[PDB]
Each structure stands twice: as structure tokens, then as C-alpha cells.
Design a protein around this ligand. Structure first.
Ligand SMILES: N[C@@H]1[C@@H](O)[C@H](O)[C@@H](CO)O[C@@H]1O
Ligand SMILES: [Ca+2]
Length: 410
């Protein structure tokens, strides 16, 4: 094993080296390149990664600085986050229409929310501010044309009606909107965010994407079948994102129903995704060559989000932190690949380095996931998410409501 994680100082050093190796994949700060994205999209043969994964990377580094205190990458990350906001400061840049799912937009909004929660340095005065960006994403996702009567509600996966997948109402789109609403409620103390979060969670439960008996979290269903053709694939990030949002709602409302939802979601996650203490991507990890670029990132989000759950729902700490520790130990045990002696693969439970080429990418998602897992080992030393009581960001009462906003020509 190359990385050591047995003391705070060892974790900090390992996380710093992991942050370096992940950054080697990113070219957006170099002359002639585009800030905020990893190489891609594969549809243009420019690289392996889609736009939303750039947004996920930005958030991973906002968390990295929050957890470690290392500001080395903060200027690169600020540049990337600001470059992708679009003309209406809503993370809907029209050049990226083909990638404009509600989840894709949502992940950028969640990175902006995280920047506000973590007191990440503010953009210049003339540029969109982190809270305002999160508010704009949430507001566009609450817009009436995104909430029709099919399946009695819920967001569709895609924003443009002509995008493939507009007929799929999936968990992740709804989970992103839920999570944003719960987090905006806690930060701003505005109850309208919370009422929408409640509504969307209740929809996910009613439609049966949350299993009423086991609290497994399925993938979605199609409008032409009234959402009854449930795709029962269980992706780790769907259950973990609902757990995260539910924890924010528990912290904000102190309503026992939310504590029960946290506990039930958590029981399900530990049962389904943790194998002998190691996170495992059950729909694809069971054999090599099946996980897509998107799926290689999910276990990193699981780690970072579950770590935050322990701060805002502290009764969960003893159930979560020991399991994240064993999962991160497995992550680092397999970061031993050539040519560096520290290259990271994905198959943590297996105990062995597998070249990311088996899953047809250069390995950025695997690197991101190990960075997230190791950094989040420092959660016990970190401040909890800030609210507007101590945060430094600024909001916008008209976020998402500009006259040139895309909803005005839907
Ligand atoms: N429109 C979809 C996005 O929502 C999705 O995230 C990417 C990656 O799967 O493929 C397409 O671009
Ligand atoms: Ca490829």
C-alpha cells in the first residue's frame, strides 16, 4: 500500500497527493481549454466525461478545502464554477443543451450550495454568488412547466422536451431537487424550500421509487406507464442523496418523521451497498467492464454525503463513521497501480488494483471517488455546514426569474 491513513497527518498528506493526481485529469485551467469540465464529451470524441461530472469535480474540491484547509486549488475551482453558469446564472448554458438533465443542472447547483455551506471564497462582486446560483437552479427546477400531471407529479429526467429521456421520471432528478430544497431551507430559514422538499420526497415515496418495506431506492419509471415500470436498479448515489436531504430536513424541522426516514434510508444503505464494510456499486461492480463513466463517481458522493449526515444528524455518527473508515481503507489499499505505484482503480471490495481501462475511461471518476473518501475521513475535525447565521455568500430574490430565462420560451 502506498497511501497511509492512520493518523490525521497521514490522511492530510494522502488527500493532498490524491488531489494532485485527480487534478492531472483536468485541463480547464490551461491556455486554450474550457474551465469547469473534464475532457469530453465522448459524443464529440474529446474525452470520456460529461459536463455534469465537471460540476461534481468542482464540488469535490470545495469539500477538499473545507476538510483539509489546503486552498491550493481554490482559484482553479472558482474559475471552473463561474465559467459554467450560463447567461442567466442558472447553470443552463445553452451550448450544453444536450447534457441538460435536471440531475446535470442539479449537480452544479449542489456544488454552489456546498460552496455557500463551506464558506468557500466568494466570487467577485460583479459575478454570481454561490447561494444565488443554488437558488437559481432550485427555482428553475420548481418552475411550473417542470411539474405536470403525469404520474401525479415529479420531475422528468431531461429539461428539453426533445431530449432523449424526457419520458423518464427518475429518482436522481427528483433527489437533486429534494436535496437542494432541504439545504436551501436550512441555510436561509425559508420554509417554502422545505415545503417543496417535503412534496417531492412524498412523491418519490408514493410512486414507489422508495420501497415502502425495505427502503431500497430504485432508479425511475416512464410516463407512458404511469411510472409503474420501475427500473429496480439500485445506484448508491440515489439512496445516499435521499439520506443527505432527509438529514437536512431532520435538522431543520426536528420532526420525528424525518428522523425515521433518515434511520430507514440508512439501514437500507448499510444493508445494500456496504459489503464487509466497503461501498459497492451493486448494479455494475460485480463484473469488470460494466460501470459507465457516470457510475464510477457514485461511491465518492456516498462517502462525502454520508460524512456530512453525521454532522447534521449526529445520532447517526456511530453507524456511519466506522463503515466509511473500512470503505476508505479498501479504497487506498488498491491505489497501487502502475505507472506511479499509486494509481487508483474502482474495485475496492475486491482488494486489488484494476486498470481503469477495463471500464473504458482514463480513470478520473475513480480518482475523484478515492479523493472524496479519504478527505471525508477528516469530517470529525470539520465545521458543519454553515447557515446564513455565519455564512458569507449572498442570495438573489430573483434567481431563476430573468426575462431571458429559458422557461420564458419553453
Ligand atoms: N442528457 C443526458 C445527461 O442528462 C446525462 O447526464 C449524460 C451522461 O449520462 O448523458 C446525456 O447527455
Ligand atoms: Ca473512453
Amino acid at each position: 500500500q502506498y497511501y497511509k491513513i492512520d493518523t490525521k497527518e497521514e490522511i492530510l498528506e494522502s488527500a493532498r497527493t490524491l488531489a494532485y493526481d485527480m487534478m492531472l485529469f483536468y485541463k480547464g485551467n490551461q491556455s486554450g481549454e474550457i474551465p469547469g469540465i473534464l475532457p469530453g464529451p465522448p459524443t464529440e470524441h474529446k474525452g470520456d466525461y460529461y459536463w455534469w461530472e465537471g460540476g461534481a469535480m468542482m464540488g469535490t474540491y470545495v469539500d477538499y478545502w473545507h476538510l483539509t484547509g489546503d486552498p491550493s486549488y481554490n482559484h482553479v475551482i472558482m474559475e471552473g464554477m463561474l465559467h459554467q453558469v450560463g447567461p442567466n446564472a442558472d447553470y443552463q448554458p445553452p451550448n450544453h443543451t444536450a447534457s441538460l438533465g435536471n440531475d446535470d443542472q442539479g449537480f452544479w447547483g449542489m456544488s454552489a450550495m456546498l460552496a455557500a455551506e463551506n464558506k468557500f471564497p466568494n466570487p467577485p462582486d460583479d459575478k454570481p454568488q454561490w447561494l444565488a446560483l443554488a437558488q437559481a437552479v432550485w427555482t428553475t427546477q420548481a418552475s411550473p412547466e417542470r411539474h405536470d400531471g403525469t404520474c401525479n407529479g415529479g420531475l422528468r429526467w431531461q429539461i428539453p422536451p426533445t431530449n432523449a429521456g424526457y419520458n423518464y421520471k427518475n429518482t436522481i432528478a427528483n433527489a437533486c431537487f429534494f436535496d437542494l430544497g432541504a439545504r436551501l431551507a436550512r441555510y436561509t430559514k425559508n420554509n417554502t424550500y422545505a415545503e417543496w422538499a417535503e412534496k417531492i420526497f412524498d412523491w418519490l415515496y408514493a410512486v414507489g421509487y422508495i420501497d415502502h418495506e425495505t427502503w431500497a431506492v430504485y432508479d425511475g419509471g416512464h410516463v407512458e406507464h404511469n411510472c409503474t415500470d420501475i427500473n429496480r436498479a439500485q445506484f448508491s448515489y440515489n439512496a445516499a442523496l435521499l439520506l443527505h436531504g432527509a438529514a437536512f430536513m431532520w435538522n431543520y424541522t426536528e420532526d420525528q418523521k424525518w428522523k425515521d426516514r433518515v434511520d430507514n434510508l440508512l439501514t437500507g444503505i448499510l444493508r445494500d451497498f456496504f459489503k464487509d464494510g466497503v461501498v459497492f456499486e451493486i448494479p455494475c461492480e460485480g463484473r469488470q467492464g460494466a460501470c459507465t463513466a457516470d457510475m464510477l463517481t457514485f461511491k465518492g458522493y456516498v462517502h462525502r454525503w454520508m460524512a456530512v449526515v453525521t454532522q447534521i444528524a449526529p445520532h447517526t455518527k456511530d453507524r456511519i463513521l466506522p463503515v466509511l473508515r473500512t470503505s476508505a481503507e479498501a479504497a487506498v489499499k488498491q491505489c497501487v497501480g502502475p505507472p506511479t505505484g499509486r494509481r487508483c482503480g474502482f474495485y475496492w471490495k475486491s482488494g486489488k488494483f484494476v486498470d481503469p481501462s477495463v471500464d473504458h475511461t482514463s480513470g478520473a471518476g475513480e480518482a475523484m471517488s478515492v479523493l472524496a473518501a479519504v478527505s471525508s475521513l477528516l469530517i470529525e475535525y470539520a465545521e458543519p455546514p454553515a447557515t446564513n447565521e455565519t455564512g458569507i455568500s449572498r442570495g438573489d430574490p430573483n434567481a431563476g426569474m430573468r426575462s431571458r430565462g429559458a422557461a420564458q420560451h419553453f
